[PDB]
Amino acid sequence: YTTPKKNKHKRKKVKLAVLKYYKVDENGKISRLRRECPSDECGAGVFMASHFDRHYCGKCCLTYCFN
Amino acid sequence: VMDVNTALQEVLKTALIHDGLARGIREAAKALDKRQAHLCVQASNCDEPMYVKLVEALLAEHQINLIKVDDNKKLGEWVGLCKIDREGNPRKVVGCSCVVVKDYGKESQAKDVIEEYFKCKK
Numbered sequence: 525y526t527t528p529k530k531n532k533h534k535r536k537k538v539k540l541a542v543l544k545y546y547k548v549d550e551n552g553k554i555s556r557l558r559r560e561c562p563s564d565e566c567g568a569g570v571f572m573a574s575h576f577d578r579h580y581c582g583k584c585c586l587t588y589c590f591n
Numbered sequence: 592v593m594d595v596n597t598a599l600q601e602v603l604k605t606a607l608i609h610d611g612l613a614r615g616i617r618e619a620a621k622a623l624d625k626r627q628a629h630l631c632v633q634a635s636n637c638d639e640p641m642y643v644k645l646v647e648a649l650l651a652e653h654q655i656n657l658i659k660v661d662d663n664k665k666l667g668e669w670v671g672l673c674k675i676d677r678e679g680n681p682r683k684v685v686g687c688s689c690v691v692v693k694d695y696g697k698e699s700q701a702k703d704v705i706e707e708y709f710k711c712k713k
């Protein structure tokens with residue numbers, strides 16, 4: 525009943541209705557956009573994140589920074 | 592034309608009751624990029640060109656067969672992606688737009704896609 529903050533909001537997902545992971549050029553080739561994760565489970569599999577400084581894999585949970 | 596469309600009906604039915612076949616764009620991409628996937632099935636009534644040019648241009652650079660069906664909704668009813676009661680909705684979901692068969696389960700009705708690949712190579 526003390527209520528110092530009146531709630532705690534819980535996360536809503538981003539809900540963006542597209543992937544946009546691929547590009548095609550001059551009648552099309554496959555074009556990966558991110559550095560492919562070298563993890564054994566998903567090698568040449570799922571893609572890594574593109575943050576402002578680093579890359580990040582959602583499955584294998586490993587990152588590559590560029591200092 | 593019955594002996595090909597009903598043929599891959601039986602093929603995808605035995606595939607989904609025997610294992611998991613990929614349903615939807617992301618599992619389709621991640622399943623056909625791996626070098627074990629069999630033929631893809633994708634819809635014809637897509638409303639945007641980058642989706643279709645993506646899926647055909649990205650299956651043609653592999654060595655995998657393709658069969659195209661007219662509507663996505665009735666395909667999604669076919670692919671088991673529903674909650675079908677026998678007296679209610681046939682497809683209460685927006686049907687699937689593209690699948691890929693990872694495995695056939697068994698070799699009962701593989702002759703249909705064999706002659707499909709034959710007429711593709713004709």
Ligand SMILES: [Zn+2]
Binds near residue numbers: 561570581582583584
């Ligand atoms: Zn990974």
